[PDB]
From Swiss-Prot, chain A:
Interacts with SUPT4H1 to form DSIF. DSIF interacts with the positive transcription elongation factor b complex (P-TEFb complex), which is composed of CDK9 and cyclin-T (CCNT1 or CCNT2). DSIF interacts with RNA polymerase II (Pol II); forms DNA and RNA clamps that stabilize Pol II elongation complex while maintaining the nontemplate DNA strand in the transcription bubble and nascent RNA in the exit channel. This interaction is reduced by phosphorylation of the C-terminal domain (CTD) of POLR2A by P-TEFb. Ubiquitously expressed. This is Transcription elongation factor SPT5. The gene is SUPT5H. The modification N6-acetyllysine is found at residue 436. RNA binds at residue 352.
Length: 471, 49, 171
RNA sequence: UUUUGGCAUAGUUGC
DNA sequence: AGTACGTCCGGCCCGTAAATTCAGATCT
DNA sequence: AGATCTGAATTTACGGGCGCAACTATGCCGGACGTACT
């Protein structure tokens, strides 16, 4: 049989090249210059080059002559190996889609109404627009009042709206798009997308037991992992040999009194120690708090890192400072001087902390930051905390035992107990001294002297301010 | 822009051929004395080659 | 437990303390440094039994200090998991119990506390009492507790006490 | 109330 | 409908190795 | 005695290096796409 030979082609124009070469073949099949090649292959997903079927490379070179698109493969060609000739043709493979082209590329879009004409489908989308304010972007809800105010191409039918290139919207964009312009298989949106509109996790080092089979009740440490049929390699107790278990035969079993982290769920991120291992209700207590946390065995992993569980000084306004007590997705929980916890936006100002500031306690003892101070008066009387920030008449105390606001509170300082020269850049004239007569400009100024760059000579010298007289 | 480049940097030859394209032909005119300007006007360079 | 061991420490003596009483100065500085400190691997150093050998004073190039290594016999408290210890209960709360072993603080959680014990908030002394009152755990009492685990974090050991084994608790 | 900031090949010049 | 505008994708030298040629080991 | 390889002793390309510190100039994305405005 003939062999396939690779020919480099213009990127994105392989099928057009194949059409042109077929037309050339038909246009010179009866002439004295016949194309002796047999066939041309331009695969869909193979971009950049094509294949030509022929018994010789000379046939390939003499056939592709006159085709500019293949000129980068004209001088030399490479034969496809004989054993890989099958692989040239080997091909593999109220919902949600994702638009291909436009600014909404790879954006989740809910299929609202499917047109039976099989040309387009109505899709619900979130607009990635600037409302005609920057152009002459991230996803955000569609604000009708803003685009009515800014004007431009906008037509209003209450909640129904047309704008900016016939984009249709209602209350959220609702526009028709071709199914060929979207992907109708393999989106799988997340819970956040639903609000907008089994699983196996075994890690190396974790301890797992055996729930069934002839190797039941063998606890061992995980070494490796795979997708579904793990064929795991666990280091059991009192066994130097390495056995085999799939994902289904194991379970994330852990002995009491060991480090535990939560992989997912409402208790995700919190660390701690498991106390009693019941059948499936595994109870633990966090490093931060002392509350009961009940988790499934699969919701536990063996990780020995310390818990994360921050505390930056920010300005709520120029009259009152604030201390961040929790960091969130889009806001700061800030505890202020008044003791009032507030929730503020990311865009408060960072104040310059004064770590050397001095404050007086209730007994006329100087106190600085990081000093353990007892609260003898005020709402928080009886507690004892470490100072972290200072004000004219307030002090912020941290306490690990206190589970409120990350242990941070505030008390007045008197209810605690310890446990530019104007002459700069001014044209001046030496009215006294050896340099009399001259003119200069003041570079630096002090209480006594001042530097003057002398205009007259190529130097700067210092003189008493008494020797100066301004112009 | 080609001639402007070849006089702008002293490289002589194609811009992408700078690996082996001989350079050092067009130089900033020596303006310090009249004699210096004259001596730079009449200067002849032999390449190493 | 208290263990009388020879340990190594370094002292960078500044030139101002040179002259007479130099050996006295390094002895005093070792006393000031090691005493009252805790190390994660070696537990609580209690006191310097004695300073055994004063090493050669290597004068630091470029710095001016003089480095002295010192061998010294000191006693260290090292807790042992899987051991019973006499402990003095310091703090009693509804959540757990805190006990002192030397300078070190150990804990008895709500569940490491035996189920037979139950807190007695209504009584004048807040204490954990059994139904028969054969053992009553309050503050300031000598209890025999098993060390479940020496949980060490940042140069400070805190252990966990347990009364799950028999013959434990008060005497 | 505190300052900053490039890498490169080529060219010429100075003991 | 045309064209501008802007954003996005593609001489020596000395080792060093390697290729050829006579005695020596077999194998007649 | 001879062959026939065959195992150690002469001739060819081929990288890879080439004394020290300042002052000035140029250039590092073009083609295609794609839509919005007039």
């Amino acid at each position: 049989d003939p062999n396939l030979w690779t020919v480099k082609c213009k990127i994105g124009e392989e099928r057009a090249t194949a059409i042109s070469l077929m037309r050339k073949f038909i246009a010179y099949q009866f002439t004295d210059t016949p194309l002796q090649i047999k066939s041309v292959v331009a695969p869909e997903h193979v971009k950049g080059y094509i294949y030509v079927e022929a018994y010789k490379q000379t046939h390939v070179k003499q056939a592709i002559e006159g085709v500019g698109n293949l000129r980068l493969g004209y001088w030399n060609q490479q034969m496809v190996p004989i054993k890989e000739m099958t692989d040239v043709l080997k091909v593999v493979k109220k919902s949600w889609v994702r638009l291909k082209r436009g600014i909404y590329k790879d954006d989740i879009a809910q299929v609202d109404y499917v047109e039976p004409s099989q040309n387009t489908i109505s899709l619900k989308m979130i607009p990635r627009i600037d409302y005609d304010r920057i152009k002459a972007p991230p996803q955000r809800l569609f604000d009708a009042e803003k685009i009515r105010s800014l004007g431009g191409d906008v037509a209003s039918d209450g909640d129904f709206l047309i704008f900016e290139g016939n984009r249709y919207s209602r209350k959220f964009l609702f526009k028709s798009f071709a199914m060929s312009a979207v992907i109708t298989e393999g989106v799988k949106p997340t819970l956040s997308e639903l609000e907008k509109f089994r699983e196996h996790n075994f890690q190396p080092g974790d301890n797992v037991e055996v729930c069934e089979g002839e190797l039941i009740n063998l606890q061992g440490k995980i070494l490796s992992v795979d997708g579904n049929k793990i064929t795991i390699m666990p280091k059991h107790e009192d066994l130097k040999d390495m056995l085999e278990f799939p994902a289904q035969e194991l379970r994330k079993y852990f002995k009491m009194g060991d480090h535990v982290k939560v992989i997912a769920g409402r208790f995700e991120g919190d660390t701690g120690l498991i106390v009693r291992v019941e059948e499936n209700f595994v109870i633990l207590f966090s490093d931060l708090t002392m509350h009961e946390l009940k988790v499934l065995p699969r919701d536990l992993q063996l990780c020995s890192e310390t818990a994360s569980g921050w505390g930056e000084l920010v300005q709520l306004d120029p009259q009152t400072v604030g201390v961040i007590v929790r960091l969130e997705r889009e806001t700061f929980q800030v505890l202020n001087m008044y003791g009032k916890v507030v929730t503020v936006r990311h865009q408060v100002t960072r104040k310059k902390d004064n770590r050397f500031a001095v404050a007086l306690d209730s007994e006329q003892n100087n106190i600085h930051v990081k000093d353990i101070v007892k609260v003898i008066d005020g709402p928080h009387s009886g507690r004892e905390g470490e100072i972290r920030h200072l004000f004219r008449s307030f002090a912020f105390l941290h306490c690990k035992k206190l589970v409120e606001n990350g242990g941070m509170f505030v008390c007045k300082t008197r209810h605690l107990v310890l446990a530019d020269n104007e002459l700069i850049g001014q044209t001046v004239r030496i009215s006294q001294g050896p340099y009399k007569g001259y003119i200069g400009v003041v570079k630096d100024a002090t209480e006594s002297t001042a530097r003057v760059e002398l205009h007259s000579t190529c130097q700067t010298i210092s003189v008493d301010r008494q020797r100066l007289t301004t112009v | 822009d080609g001639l402007k480049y070849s006089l702008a940097t002293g490289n002589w030859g194609d811009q992408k051929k700078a690996h082996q394209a001989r350079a050092g032909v067009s130089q900033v005119l020596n303006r310090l004395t009249f004699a210096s300007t004259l001596s730079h006007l009449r200067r002849l360079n032999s390449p190493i080659g | 437990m208290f263990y009388h061991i020879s340990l190594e420490h370094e002292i960078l003596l500044h030139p101002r303390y040179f002259g007479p009483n130099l050996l006295n100065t390094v002895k005093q500085k070792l006393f000031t440094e090691v005493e009252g400190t805790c190390t994660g691997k070696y537990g609580f150093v209690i006191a310097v039994t004695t300073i055994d050998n004063i090493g050669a004073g290597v004068i630091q190039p470029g710095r001016g200090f003089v480095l002295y290594p010192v061998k010294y016999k000191a006693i260290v408290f090292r807790p042992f998991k899987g051991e019973v210890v006499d402990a003095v209960v310091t703090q009693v709360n509804k959540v757990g119990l805190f006990t002192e072993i030397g300078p070190m603080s150990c804990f008895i959680s709500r569940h490491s506390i035996p189920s037979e014990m139950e807190f007695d908030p209504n009584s004048n002394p807040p204490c954990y009492k059994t139904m028969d009152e054969d053992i009553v755990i309050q503050q300031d009492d000598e209890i025999r507790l098993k060390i479940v685990g020496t949980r060490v974090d940042k140069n400070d050991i805190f252990a966990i006490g347990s009364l799950m084994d028999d013959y434990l608790g008060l005497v």
